[PDB]
Design a protein around this nucleic acid. Structure first.
Ligand SMILES: *C(=O)c1cnc2ccccc2n1
Ligand SMILES: *C(=O)c1cnc2ccccc2n1
Lengths: 8, 10
DNA sequence: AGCCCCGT
DNA sequence: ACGGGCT
């Protein structure tokens, strides 16, 4: 859920 | 980090 | 080389 | 079920 490096 | 020393994160 | 970490 | 960006 977070997007800091992937954003799922 | 930074830039420099992007982000984190972005 | 890195206050490098995060939830819906 | 998920790996990313510039000084
Ligand atoms: C998003 O909120 C979120 C939280 N935990 C995860 C674990 C593994 C893959 C993706 C995830 N996304
Ligand atoms: C993004 O690809 C990414 C990878 N590893 C992490 C570890 C801890 C927090 C956030 C992260 N983000």
């Amino acid at each position: 859920x977070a997007x800091v490096x992937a954003x799922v | 980090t930074x830039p420099g020393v992007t982000x984190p994160g972005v």
